Amino acid sequence: GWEVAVRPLLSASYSAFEMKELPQLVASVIESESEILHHEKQYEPFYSSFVALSTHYITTVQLQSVAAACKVLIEFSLLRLENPDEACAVSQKHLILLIKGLCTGCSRLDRTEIITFTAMMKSAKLPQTVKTLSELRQKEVQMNFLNQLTSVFNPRTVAASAIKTKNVFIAQ
Amino acid sequence: NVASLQELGGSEKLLRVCLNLPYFLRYINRFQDAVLANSFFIMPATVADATAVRNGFHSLVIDVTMALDTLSLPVLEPLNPSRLQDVTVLSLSCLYAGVSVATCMAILHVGSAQQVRTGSTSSKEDDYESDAATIVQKCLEIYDMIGQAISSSRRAGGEHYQNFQLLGAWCLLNSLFLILNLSPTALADKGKRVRDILSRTKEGVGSPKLGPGKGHQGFGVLSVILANHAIKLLTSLFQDLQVTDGPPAALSIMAQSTSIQRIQRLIDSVPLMNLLLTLLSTSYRKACVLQRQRKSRKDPELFLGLASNILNFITSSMLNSRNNFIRNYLSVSLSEHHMATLASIIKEVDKDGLKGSSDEEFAAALYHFNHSLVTSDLQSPNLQNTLLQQLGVAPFSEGPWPLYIHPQSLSVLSRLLLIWQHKASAQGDPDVPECLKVWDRFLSTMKQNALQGVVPSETEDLNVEHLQMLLLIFHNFTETGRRAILSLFVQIIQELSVNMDAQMRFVPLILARLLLIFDYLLHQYSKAPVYLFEQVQHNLLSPPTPLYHGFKEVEENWSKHFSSDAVPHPRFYCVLSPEASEDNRLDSVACDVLFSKLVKYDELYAALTALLAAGSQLDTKENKNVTALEACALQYYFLILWRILGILPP
């Protein structure tokens, strides 16, 4: 379900982002691609705040899956910047600075807005259930294996640890 | 002082003085004819003509020094179109002069290689080579300075800089092709352009055989420097290209053209891919030969760096390109001989092993090129089969399967097989015949080795990663293939136990591996463990010690007898994780297959009961010592057989 998908962001809203919570978040973003971009009005703000929090958390810090998720979010923000509807929980300037942050060192969004994002998060109705917000290991390993097998990540063509990890992240 | 200098209009006078030199005039004229006729002219001609062009080198040195000094003054700012044309003419003529002296020195070295003379190195030849190095370095310096001046000007912009780079790359690539097409003796002795060479190569039914012979005795430091500059220009042009079959881009600094037009002009001038791979192969061969002899020109790291750089250019600029036309060209221009050369390079690097940091960088580059070529769907399947066969690990080969595969060959082989399996499973194609054939051949070779009772060497049979990739390949099969393989395994076990008297004196090492594989099949016949995926990712698909689950007790004795904390080659390994040590749940589908037709369970149990005495007679008389390998082999085999006998129901 989507509730178990959004648990990690809700838990991390009161702390930092646990390293354990990233890969399943990435898997949730990839598996939801067929759904994230085509939607009705009532669910759109919930998706907007979800993507805002997810982007904020990824830019606060296996590379292939992260790159795929980041491309997913960048595309969704792009087509929100083209159309923008009235009922978008995140207005156009925050999409612009979020896109900048994903391409930079994450110094755009502030606490004062992500509190409102979490509040709307809770106040928003879920896609699969009318109720509002207010095994797996082998499967995820197999997707990671297939993702690595299909395509080869650079790595050294672009080119102490944090800096080159950050540089390859911006390159992707 | 500079106010005084540009007040007198000294820039025009200095440029006019530099243009009409009595010695650069021939180079300027030749460059003009080359650009007019679209061809490329270099005339060192024969060895005698090379000497005639030589011996005047000091005048060329003093000329290039004075020209560089003149161009180092601020006399270039008002880049009018006429001034632009004059400046590019001068710079490109100087580059042509550097190319020509490099070709002359290469021809002289080839002619010296023709005749075996043991005379000591004289001072005159040393002066000549130093002069050649100085003139080529100064020519490159002049070219770079003029390019920087053109790029940063406020009257000549990006388009003129692009045309300048295109002209430089064209000259450099033509020079490299000519210098690498020098014959050792045949054309050099029978000679006593580039269009004539292309025509004569096309007319001949068979291409010039530049194979494993000693023909490529040219090359050198000058070739490496020229290739480095050419590759820099090429990567600049292709990076520009990345972001209707028209005419090739005009070779004028004032021409207007797109990046595709410039690249297509470069392709029209010379077939690029063959040239690039030829330089890669020649550079690696020279580096390896020099490294072998050892145990600028006396060091091998320069040629290895050039090879790594050209390979990295081929990877980043071409393989990963998004443009459709360049991908079409790459698909068209790949040849089987290139695959043979790549297989030779892979064999050389895996046999040689790790040597140094430059070797590490070259290995990383080769790994990346190999996997990028495999994954991104340009090579036709026949080319992949050619690469496999030249590697000696073709899935349809008739000989015995090589039980030891070197890491690079294993990586590429596993990558291709897993890609085939993934594509077939996603589409719905039944099981790929290649994997069935490889499993059958592996089992047949294993059976023959078990029958012969042969103990292989440490670098001979069945390293761990080979087995892991084989197991993962097995897991992807359908139920029919897996039950067929289990039935074949049962048949092997039943048949091989009939000659027990001969077995009693053999050393059961192949038997131990067979029993380990059977135990793994019995434990995980249906599903595939996570640690297998992690190991196959880390050991094979990750860029460049392996990770496995070897027997703690057996490896204890093996390391104790090995003593000096090395254990580089793991010979006693286990595939299943130690976590299953707790009472070891047999698979339901496994026993469902076991208690059915196509297998005869009673004689199967009898064979496993009888096989417990497969090494009883080894210790028995000749006063010969029992080495550590054999003792560990018997203990390993007995432990494996005891474990498997404790799981099968009676």
Add this chain to the structure above:
Amino acid sequence: IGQAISSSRRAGGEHYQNFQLLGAWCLLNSLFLILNLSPTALADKGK
């Protein structure tokens, strides 16, 4: 934007010169207008 135009590999010195000319034209016209402001006469009579 001027720095982007100057260092590009498709737009060169001439385009940068035109960009500078346009900027200087706008700036100089603005300065002339702002320095020709009347204290009260044209300001009040412009009502």
